[PDB]
């Protein structure tokens, strides 16, 4: 019964796929080569940088390091707002309210720590730590203040209420460790990528997993949400970058090269969606046509493997962190 | 630095958080990070609790701040986060000379962790305990109930020098050194043992960092 | 969070007196502290600065010599000691704090300040006594000799109400940016002529209302505006 549903399933895929979208994308012009150079650079951090994230003004960013500190930085007088220290160094991942006055983090203590950016005290304090997670956490990412969903290494991801401190939600559904999620503009749904090589999309308020996508060949490890929501672009350690459709339920496009042979860390939309930036292992980014299968540009200002990337809500400056304990925007 | 709150937003940011940022590196630049690998009932938690998620032990010896980071509650894939314990200074692992399916499974597991590519330059202090049990228990059964091909005799130095140089043929790099020591659960002088053997790794590390090859 | 001074009294021309401030609530290390003055005359005056850390040292153009500011962080003191003092130092002398990053609130909290006895770009306050109605929207408006409206927009004026026998609370820190703990009835708004909109005033909101400004070191108040029910 399983494999008559599969079945059926790939017979409705392939039943829609009437055009590629390479083929329809020909019509127009490409970006050309995508000059970008660097503008500021943050020196403070001693150890790898492995998560970064911005602030919804696209002036702070927070970025985490493996020296156990959460810097807040001025994007754009270099000086640094706060340094929080964390209890566990071992963090994986970093996120930014929306409002601006919370900070989050987790990795492998199995804890999403919340921190409070604005008090009274005038010192950044630990506001409510998160457990119930078995495995590593590897991405958060907040709806509210109150509400942040969490991605794990046991194979489930979860929506907390930090008031409450409990799980409302457990999504459960994959067999590898989930890696990073991604979620929509509305945060009425989200995306995430495990190591069982498929991504899954998921409904917050039901809980239930809606459709899952088998492209890639070995375990994703980063996922990111088109600007216009119902379309998400995947990285996975066989340096290939696809990318899916939430209508059409299949993979729509792919981002590979034969000189690219390492995996990616980390992808990232622009602001219309028409560029495509992923951090390799190559020490180096690559910019990419997302209408197209073509390279545009290279961000090679890093001597060490980049593991996060963003960019600001107005599409003005791109910050990448790596393993040789640096932030460099790019515009 | 045009504007006087803008001027006292730099002084705080390069006098005050940047100051807390140095101290922190100069006071973390005195420890050293071990990795703590093994199997069930290996010994790897008596050692540790000798001495003293993620479990994060951490103790001084020698003016040298150890911190062993028993990985074992990671029940998660191994090939997803260790590449965290990258600037390690060694790996100890722990194998149970009692028995012979762990024998082979920590022949396998060595196998891996000494050939993979974030610890091709990374040391292993590798040891091998329950030398009692191990001695008490082939002076009456042979060692080659574990491996079919052992030829050399059944008595405890030559059957436990078979089992050191199995480990040791599992390194193909050059650079790596295993450092095999033999211990029990009343041994005492594991710390010094490794002490001993991070120094020689600092030397290692000098000798590559200096040019000098 | 709570600053309280203490060390006034009478003092003979030609003398001299310490000031210490007594902080406990918050980081004091992080804060960045002031000294402010007012004569009996509800007029605010600004007195000496000192940086967090003890670097920057600022002092006012009246004090300067006389007057040696100076804290010590792991005791939470702050000391002012002043030589010399003249008739024209009979004042009470307030405690406030004042941190400085992007996006922060300087001059958040005022302590209760303590009297003693001794026996740039002005800011224009016009309008001088006001008869408040209570339940109809008032304004108050301020006055600045040279433009607040730095290059990198912030335009620094502060708000700042003194009810009848209390210290004065941070309505607004720049223009446009409501305090925290203070009611949304308030609005701030102009350039430069810079207005405070009180839309549906309430009781409880009687004082004399000053305008401040954090452009220059030469730190002016305004002169005071007051409302009377």
């Known amino acids: 019964e399983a494999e008559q549903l599969k079945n059926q399933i790939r017979d409705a895929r392939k039943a829609c796929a009437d055009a590629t979208l390479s083929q329809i994308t020909n019509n127009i012009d490409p970006v050309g080569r995508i000059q970008m150079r660097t503008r500021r650079t943050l020196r403070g951090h001693l150890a790898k940088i492995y998560a970064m994230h911005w602030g919804t003004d696209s002036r702070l960013l927070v970025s985490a390091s493996q020296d156990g500190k959460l810097i807040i930085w001025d994007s754009y007088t270099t000086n640094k707002v706060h340094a929080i220290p964390l209890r566990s160094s071992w963090v994986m991942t970093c996120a930014y309210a929306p409002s601006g006055n919370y900070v989050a983090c987790g990795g492998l203590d199995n804890i999403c720590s919340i921190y409070n950016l604005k008090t009274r005290e005038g010192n950044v304090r630990v506001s409510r730590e998160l457990a119930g997670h078995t495995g590593y956490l590897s991405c958060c990412r907040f709806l509210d203040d109150n509400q942040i969903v969490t991605s794990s290494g046991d194979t489930t991801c979860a929506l907390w209420d930090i008031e409450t401190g409990q799980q409302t939600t457990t999504f459960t559904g994959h067999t590898g460790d989930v890696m990073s999620l991604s979620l929509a503009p509305d945060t009425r749904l989200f995306v995430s990528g495990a190591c069982d090589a498929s991504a899954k999309l998921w409904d917050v308020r039901e809980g239930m997993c809606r459709q899952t996508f088998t492209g890639h060949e070995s375990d994703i490890n980063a996922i990111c949400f088109f600007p216009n929501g119902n379309a998400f672009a995947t990285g996975s350690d066989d340096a290939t970058c696809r990318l899916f459709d939430l209508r059409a339920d299949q993979e729509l496009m792919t981002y590979s090269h034969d000189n690219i042979i390492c995996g990616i860390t980390s992808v990232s939309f622009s602001k219309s969606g028409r560029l495509l930036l992923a951090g390799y292992d190559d020490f180096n980014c690559n910019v990419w046509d997302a209408l197209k299968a073509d390279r545009a540009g290279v961000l090679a200002g890093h001597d060490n493997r980049v593991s996060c990337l963003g960019v600001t809500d107005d599409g003005m400056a791109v910050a990448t962190g790596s393993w040789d304990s640096f932030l460099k925007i790019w515009n | 630095t045009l504007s006087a709150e803008d001027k006292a937003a730099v002084e705080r940011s390069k006098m005050g958080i940047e100051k807390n940022l140095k101290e922190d590196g100069i006071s973390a630049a005195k420890d050293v990070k071990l990795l703590l690998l093994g199997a069930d009932n290996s010994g790897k938690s008596t050692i540790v609790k000798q001495m003293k998620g993620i479990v994060e032990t951490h103790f001084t010896f020698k003016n040298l701040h150890f911190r062993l980071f028993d990985v074992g509650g990671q029940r998660s894939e191994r090939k997803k986060w260790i590449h965290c314990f990258e600037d390690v200074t060694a790996i100890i692992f722990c194998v149970d000379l009692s028995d012979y399916n762990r024998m082979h499974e920590s022949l396998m597991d060595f196998d891996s962790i000494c050939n993979n590519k974030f610890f091709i330059d990374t040391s292993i202090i590798l040891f091998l305990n329950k030398k009692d049990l191990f001695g008490e228990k082939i002076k009456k059964s042979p060692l080659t109930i574990c491996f079919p091909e052992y030829t050399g005799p059944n008595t405890y130095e030559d059957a436990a020098a078979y089992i050191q140089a199995q480990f040791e043929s599992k390194n193909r790099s050059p650079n790596k050194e295993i450092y095999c020591h033999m211990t029990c659960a009343t041994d005492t002088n594991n710390a010094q043992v490794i002490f001993d053997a991070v120094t020689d790794i600092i030397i290692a590390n000098n000798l590559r960092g200096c040019g000098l090859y | 969070v709570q600053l309280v001074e203490s060390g006034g009294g009478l003092v003979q021309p030609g003398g001299s007196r310490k000031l210490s401030c007594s902080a406990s609530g918050f980081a004091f290390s992080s804060f960045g502290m002031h000294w402010v003055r007012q004569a009996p005359e509800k007029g605010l005056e600004w007195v000496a600065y000192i940086s967090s850390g003890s670097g920057t040292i600022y002092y006012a153009d009246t004090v300067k010599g006389r007057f040696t500011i100076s804290r010590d962080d792991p005791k939470n003191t702050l000391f002012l000691q002043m030589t010399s003092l003249r008739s024209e130092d009979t004042a009470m002398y307030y405690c406030?704090?004042?941190?400085?990053?992007?996006?922060?609130?300087?001059?958040?909290?005022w302590g209760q300040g303590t009297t003693l006895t001794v026996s740039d770009i002005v800011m224009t306050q016009a309008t001088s006594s006001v008869p408040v109605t209570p339940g109809e929207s008032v304004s108050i408006s301020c006055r600045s000799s040279k433009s607040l409206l730095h290059s990198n927009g912030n335009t620094y004026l502060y708000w700042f109400l003194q009810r009848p026998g209390q210290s004065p609370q941070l309505l607004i820190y720049?223009?446009?940016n409501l305090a925290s703990g203070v009611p949304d009835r308030f609005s701030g708004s102009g350039s430069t002529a810079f207005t405070l909109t009180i839309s549906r005033l309430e009781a409880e909101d009687v004082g004399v209302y000053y305008c401040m400004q954090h452009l220059e070191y030469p730190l002016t108040f305004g002169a005071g505006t007051k409302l009377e029910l």
């Open positions: 406030v704090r004042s941190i400085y990053y992007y996006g922060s609130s300087p001059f958040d909290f």
């Open positions: 720049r223009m446009s």
